[PDB]
Amino acid sequence: PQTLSRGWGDQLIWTQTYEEALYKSKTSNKPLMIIHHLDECPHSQALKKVFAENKEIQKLAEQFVLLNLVYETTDKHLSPDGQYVPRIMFVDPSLTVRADITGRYSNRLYAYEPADTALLLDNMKKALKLL
């Protein structure tokens, strides 16, 4: 009944906790993608729909360590300019947060709309280029 995917894609392997996600990213050399969202946020719901119904994003998501959280993480580096949802952040396998990978908007550096799927794909491809 209760699923790790939370509607962001079911054929994908998701990590439960941040620490195990970091361990997986370090061991397997796969970049970690973190999606912050809320179940009572219509913006998160629409972005969830677009993310789940995008073939290319689902295909590229298998090259990552995936993690979606409904609550704020304990890491201070994951919210450089505020705590809001929906918010997608990237972490290099070097355990270095890729805060330089940002979206298209200035007030919310890491917020994605249900139209910036090409931008999300570009940012994921950029994140795959390891430091």
Partner: protein
């Protein structure tokens, strides 16, 4: 009569008796100061702070005393003792119907098993008073200004300066000490509200919660003081980037959440300058520190 008095507890432990209607300064009492890596304590609610920058402990001083001896996830051990005092005060002359004022003195000694001799102390004195439309009592953070506006409408009645800041307003109700609610405001905020609107209407203009850091003869002390847009906050540790892009409003604000003492990851910022570690201990108003992710283990 005791009912007409309004005892005001300040930072240095004094107890200033005032008339409720007029606010004139009656007798005053002299007692010990309210409060005495580093630990900064809120002298109003007993909260404790870790000086990663600055953070807030999830346990106040009385909780640590009741749970002592204990240890946290960081490894810091906590010891605690409590001791009361029951001086009797004449309502008229203010010497030590009679006034029954009880004070509890809390002491928490923190030692870390890593550093063998280095340790820290703290003290926090709480008056024995239960917590009892518009807020009637407002206290300035930096200065000792006390405001009394009408709960019925919201018009000021009397202002009084006491010197050191005010950390509690008490009244003698039924036949004991009772703590009236109060709000901490920046003096600039009170002045702005007085000149612009003319009637204070604080619920019981944007008012922002800031954590004022003050310094006195007993050490550093924090306080939760509201400010208006116009009060100069001390700059934060990070200035991210002067990005110019379209603005989006389709986000939802999310709770802060707890934060870890020692970071687990590095960070790389986009062409953005990083400054000093948030420069706490500066006289001024800071953004609200995050509460620290930790638990307790009673030994």
């Amino acid at each position: 009569r005791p009912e007409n008095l309004l005892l005001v507890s300040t930072l240095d432990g004094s107890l200033h008796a005032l008339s409720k209607q007029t606010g004139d300064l009656k007798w005053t009492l002299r007692d010990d100061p309210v409060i005495e890596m580093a630990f900064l304590s809120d002298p109003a609610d007993g909260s404790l702070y870790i000086l990663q920058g600055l953070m807030k402990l999830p346990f106040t001083i009385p909780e640590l005393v009741h749970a002592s001896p204990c240890r946290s996830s960081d490894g810091v051990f906590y010891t605690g003792r409590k001791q009361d005092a029951w001086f009797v005060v004449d309502p008229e002359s203010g010497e030590t119907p009679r006034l029954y004022i009880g004070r509890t003195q809390y002491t928490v000694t923190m030692h870390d098993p890593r550093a063998p001799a280095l340790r820290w102390n703290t003290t926090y004195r709480r008056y024995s008073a239960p917590p009892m439309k518009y807020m009637s009592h407002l206290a300035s953070c930096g200065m000792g200004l006390l405001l009394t506006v009408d709960p019925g409408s919201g018009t000021v009645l009397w202002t009084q300066d006491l010197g050191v800041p005010v950390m509690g307003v008490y009244t003698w109700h039924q036949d004991g000490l009772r703590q009236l609610p109060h709000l901490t405001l920046a003096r600039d905020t009170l002045h702005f509200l007085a000149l612009r609107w003319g009637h204070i209407r604080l619920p019981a203009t944007q008012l922002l919660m800031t954590l004022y850091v003050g310094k006195d003869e007993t050490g550093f002390y924090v306080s939760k003081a509201l400010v208006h847009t116009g009060v100069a906050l001390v700059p934060r540790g990070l200035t991210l980037a002067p990005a110019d892009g379209p603005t989006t409003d389709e986000v939802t604000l999310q709770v802060s959440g707890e934060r870890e003492g020692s970071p687990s990851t590095a960070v790389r910022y986009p062409s953005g300058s990083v400054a000093l570690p948030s420069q706490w201990l500066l006289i001024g108003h800071h953004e609200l520190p995050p509460v620290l992710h930790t638990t307790m283990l009673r030994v």
